[PDB]
Structure formats: structure tokens, C-alpha cells
Amino acid sequence: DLSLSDINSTVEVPEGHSFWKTLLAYSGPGALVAVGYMDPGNWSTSITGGQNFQYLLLSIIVISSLLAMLLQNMAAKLGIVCQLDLAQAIRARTSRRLGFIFWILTELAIMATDIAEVIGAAIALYLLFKIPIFLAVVITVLDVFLLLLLNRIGFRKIEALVVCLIFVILFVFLYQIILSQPAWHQVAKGLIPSWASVQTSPKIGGQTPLSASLGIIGATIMPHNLFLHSAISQSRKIDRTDSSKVAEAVRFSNWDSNIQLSLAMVVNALLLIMGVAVFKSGAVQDPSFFGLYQALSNPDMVSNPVLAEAARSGVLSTLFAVALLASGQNSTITGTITGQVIMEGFIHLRLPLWLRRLVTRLIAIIPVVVCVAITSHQGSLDEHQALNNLMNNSQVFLALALPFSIVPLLMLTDSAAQMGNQFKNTRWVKVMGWLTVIILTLLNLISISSQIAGFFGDNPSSQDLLLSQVISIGIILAMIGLLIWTIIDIRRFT
Numbered sequence: 001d002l003s004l005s006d007i008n009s010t011v012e013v014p015e016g017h018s019f020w021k022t023l024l025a026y027s028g029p030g031a032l033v034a035v036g037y038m039d040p041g042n043w044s045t046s047i048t049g050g051q052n053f054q055y056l057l058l059s060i061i062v063i064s065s066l067l068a069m070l071l072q073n074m075a076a077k078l079g080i081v082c083q084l085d086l087a088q089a090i091r092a093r094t095s096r097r098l099g100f101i102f103w104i105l106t107e108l109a110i111m112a113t114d115i116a117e118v119i120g121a122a123i124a125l126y127l128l129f130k131i132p133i134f135l136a137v138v139i140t141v142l143d144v145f146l147l148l149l150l151n152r153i154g155f156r157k158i159e160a161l162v163v164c165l166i167f168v169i170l171f172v173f174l175y176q177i178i179l180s181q182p183a184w185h186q187v188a189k190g191l192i193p194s195w196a197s198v199q200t201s202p203k204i205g206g207q208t209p210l211s212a213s214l215g216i217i218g219a220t221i222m223p224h225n226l227f228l229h230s231a232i233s234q235s236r237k238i239d240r241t242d243s244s245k246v247a248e249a250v251r252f253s254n255w256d257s258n259i260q261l262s263l264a265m266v267v268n269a270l271l272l273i274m275g276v277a278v279f280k281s282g283a284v285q286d287p288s289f290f291g292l293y294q295a296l297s298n299p300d301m302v303s304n305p306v307l308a309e310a311a312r313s314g315v316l317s318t319l320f321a322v323a324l325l326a327s328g329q330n331s332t333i334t335g336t337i338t339g340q341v342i343m344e345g346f347i348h349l350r351l352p353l354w355l356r357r358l359v360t361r362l363i364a365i366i367p368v369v370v371c372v373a374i375t376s377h378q379g380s381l382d383e384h385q386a387l388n389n390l391m392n393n394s395q396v397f398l399a400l401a402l403p404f405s406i407v408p409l410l411m412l413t414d415s416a417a418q419m420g421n422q423f424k425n426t427r428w429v430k431v432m433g434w435l436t437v438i439i440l441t442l443l444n445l446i447s448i449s450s451q452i453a454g455f456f457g458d459n460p461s462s463q464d465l466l467l468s469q470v471i472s473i474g475i476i477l478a479m480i481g482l483l484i485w486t487i488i489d490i491r492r493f494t
């Protein structure tokens with residue numbers, strides 16, 4: 001009846017004021033959440049944003065990472081204080097049909113992330129081991145056994161294995177930046193919140209600064225990682241009776257989370273400056289993982305004689321594919337954990353880790369093998385580009401499930417009927433939190449129409465355009481009705 005019953009309140013190791021050892025003990029949760037923010041679903045957009053705007057968009061990465069740290073810390077607070085996850089709070093404060101809608105929506109979100117991870121991992125196999133594209137996918141389906149071995153390890157090592165992956169993809173991209181020797185003064189200048197990123201005038205590669213910036217801001221948080229953080233934050237036992245101990249517990253998980261999401265922000269920065277310093281100006285014509293592989297393996301695409309010799313040897317691209325693998329491993333852990341959370345929290349369905357990863361991975365690979373089937377039926381022509389368009393079109397479910405995850409979080413944590421007059425949010429985070437939630441909800445409701453129209457490809461059928469307008473209006477209005485309904489129920493609780 002409590003979230004993550006297998007590992008809930010497992011190891012509590014606060015020892016007086018021995019803080020940093022106490023930090024070492026529970027540092028696990030934050031990395032599990034952050035590694036999701038390094039998935040290859042936006043690797044191209046950081047490199048593309050770098051080529052189109054050298055170092056300019058680095059500040060937007062910082063701001064987005066700050067907002068994500070805010071909402072993530074809020075979810076961790078709900079888990080720590082209330083000893084229950086975000087799904088259990090929402091489901092307890094609304095009916096079952098709303099918990100079911102939220103369930104299917106978040107299932108679709110983690111499914112979209114899973115589609116990104118299976119595409120990137122399968123392509124990683126096609127690049128590293130030269131496995132055929134159709135075989136690499138059905139090889140990625142075998143991660144259920146890696147989950148069986150994953151199940152016996154334990155969170156003191158699982159949450160450290162996630163750290164291992166994090167520093168794998170962090171050192172892979174940092175290594176190609178170390179060889180690049182970039183002008184770190186222009187990087188510093190880029191990290192400062194300037195107003196050139198909010199303008200619309202450069203328009204390089206069909207992208208204005210305001211468009212790229214508003215995209216980075218719009219894709220700030222992942223809805224499933226909120227429920228994830230609120231569930232994993234409970235894995236540390238707390239007496240819930242000593243205010244200094246729970247205040248300490250909140251400091252604990254906060255410093256953890258920021259320590260990890262800061263690493264994710266560093267990875268995004270390494271991707272942008274990877275697009276600025278490593279690649280030549282405009283060398284990336286194919287945002288696909290294969291396009292970045294050949295672009296990282298062509299000496300004329302780099303901007304340094306050392307990167308040309310290393311690229312000719314063939315180490316820059318292989319490291320890239322390794323990073324693709326390490327990123328593709330994340331949805332196997334966090335997808336199963338979060339899927340359990342939203343399942344047994346929203347619809348009260350107790351399912352094992354066996355059938356969970358099976359169903360999610362199958363539903364994820366069905367459109368992948370359909371796409372590979374059609375493109376290989378066209379002669380393996382534009383097969384990687386179509387996989388990239390599938391990966392990008394999948395991310396609409398995140399925009400569908402985002403408001404119903406950030407709005408109830410902010411409400412339930414801002415009410416004293418859930419946190420109490422002692423641990424509710426400061427007036428400082430009330431303003432920043434509501435500002436962030438409003439901005440993200442508006443931006444994603446804007447993204448709905450763009451992605452729904454993007455389903456019909458770059459070929460704008462005049463009759464299908466109006467249909468995309470009707471469907472978009474219907475979807476955003478339906479999300480408005482669901483949103484005001486949820487607002488009404490939660491505010492009835494408070």
C-alpha cells in the first residue's frame with residue numbers, strides 16, 4: 001500500500017552531523033533521475049543549437065537545468081515528507097478515471113522515452129558491432145534479462161552503476177572536447193543570460209534564437225522522472241517525527257539531486273560546445289545518430305588537425321556510439337521503476353518487473369520495426385532519418401502528460417493539507433514554481449500543434465493541414481478541460 005514496497009525506507013544512515021558520509025549513502029536517487037536527462041532524444045538539438053548559435057544557447061541550458069532542479073526537488077520533497085509518491089497523492093486526491101487518464105498518459109510518456117532509447121541503442125549496435133539495423137532492435141528487446149540480472153544487484157550498486165553510465169557519457173564527450181581545445185572564454189561569455197538568445201533575427205538553419213531557446217525551456221522536465229524522484233526519495237528511512245531530521249533529509253536529497261542534474265547540465269553543455277568547437281560550421285547536415293557518426297568519422301568535418309587524425313583513425317565515432325549505448329541503458333531501469341510507480345499508484349495494479357519491461361519494450365519497438373520495415377522496403381534509403389523523425393515525433397506524449405504532472409505537484413506541495421504549515425513551500429518557490437509551471441504549460445500547449453502538424457512530414461498537404469489544425473485545437477482544448485478539472489479537485493482538497 002506504500003510506494004516501492006521492495007526498497008522503501010531501506011537504509012537510513014544519518015550519524016549525528018557526519019554530513020558528507022551521510023551524503024555518500026543516499027546519493028543514489030539523484031543520479032537515477034538525472035541520467036534520464038542525458039538521453040539522446042535531444043543530443044542533436046544541442047549540437048544543432050551550437051552550430052546555429054556558437055555558445056549563445058549555453059545560458060538557456062543553465063536556466064532549463066535550474067527549473068528542472070526546482071520541480072525535481074519539489075517531487076523529492078513530496079516523497080520525503082508525505083512518505084508517498086506523486087501518483088499516490090494525485091490518485092488519492094482525485095477519482096479513478098482521472099488517475100487512469102494520468103496513468104495512460106504517463107505510460108505514453110515513458111513509452112516515448114523508451115522509443116528514443118531503443119532507437120539510439122539499436123543504432124549504437126549498428127555502429128559499434130555493425131549488427132544489421134533490424135537485428136539490433138530485436139537485440140535491444142533482450143534487455144529484460146539485463147533487468148533480471150539488474151534486479152539482484154541492489155540500489156547501493158544500481159544507483160552507482162547509473163553513476164558509472166553518467167560518467168561514461170560525460171567523459172566520452174568531455175574527451176572529444178579536451179582534444180578540441182575550445183576557446184573557453186567564449187564559452188564563459190555564452191553561459192551568461194544575455195538577451196541575444198531571446199531574439200528572432202539570426203535564423204540559422206531555419207532556427208531563430210527565440211525558437212531554440214523556447215524549445216530548450218519547453219523541454220525542461222520529463223514527467224515520469226517526477227514520479228520517479230518522489231518514489232526513490234522514500235528509499236531512505238525517515239522517522240517523520242523530528243523536524244530537524246526531516247529538514248536535514250530535505251537538504252540531503254536536494255544537494256544530491258543538484259549534484260547530479262548539474263552533471264546532466266554539464267553533458268548538455270558538452271553537446272553544445274561539441275557542436276561549436278569539434279564540428280565545423282554547418283558540417284552536421286544529418287541530425288541522425290548515423291549522421292553524427294560519419295560526421296565524427298570524417299576528417300574534413302572537424303576543425304582541428306588532431307581531431308582530423310583521430311577521426312580518420314576512427315575513435316570519435318565509436319565513443320559516440322558507446323555513449324549511445326550507455327544512454328540507451330537508462331530506460332530499462334527508470335522506465336520499469338517509474339512504470340511500477342504510476343501503475344500501482346494510479347490504477348492499483350501490482351505487476352512484476354518481468355511483464356513490465358516486456359510490454360513497454362514491445363509497444364516501444366512496434367513502431368520502430370514498422371519504420372525500419374518501410375524504409376528498408378524503400379531500399380534502406382533515408383532509414384536513419386526516418387528513425388530520427390520517429391524519435392522526435394514520439395516526444396509529443398511528454399507534452400501531453402506534462403501539465404498533469406507539474407500542476408498537481410505544485411498544488412499538493414503548496415497546500416498545507418499535504419505538507420503542513422512547517423514544510424510547505426516558501427513564498428520564494430511559490431512564485432518561481434508557478435511561473436515555471438505556467439511557462440512550461442503554455443509552451444507545451446504550443447508544441448502540441450507543431451508536433452501534430454509534424455506528424456504529416458515536411459510535405460504540407462493542404463487538406464491535411466486543416467485537419468492538423470482541428471486535431472491540434474481538440475487536443476489542447478481537451479488538455480485545458482482535464483487541467484481545470486484537476487485544478488478543481490486538488491483545490492477542493494485544499
Ligand SMILES: CCCCCCCCCCO[C@@H]1O[C@H](CO)[C@@H](O[C@H]2O[C@H](CO)[C@@H](O)[C@H](O)[C@H]2O)[C@H](O)[C@H]1O
Binds near residue numbers: 410
Ligand atoms: C499566459 C499569461 C501568463 C501570465 C503569467 C503571470 C504569472 C502570475 C503568477 C501567479 O502566481 C501564483 O498564481 C496562483 C493562482 O492565482 C496563486 O494561487 C495559488 O496559491 C497556492 C500557492 O501559494 C496554490 O496552492 C494554489 O493552488 C493557487 O491558487 C499563487 O498564490 C500565486 O503565487
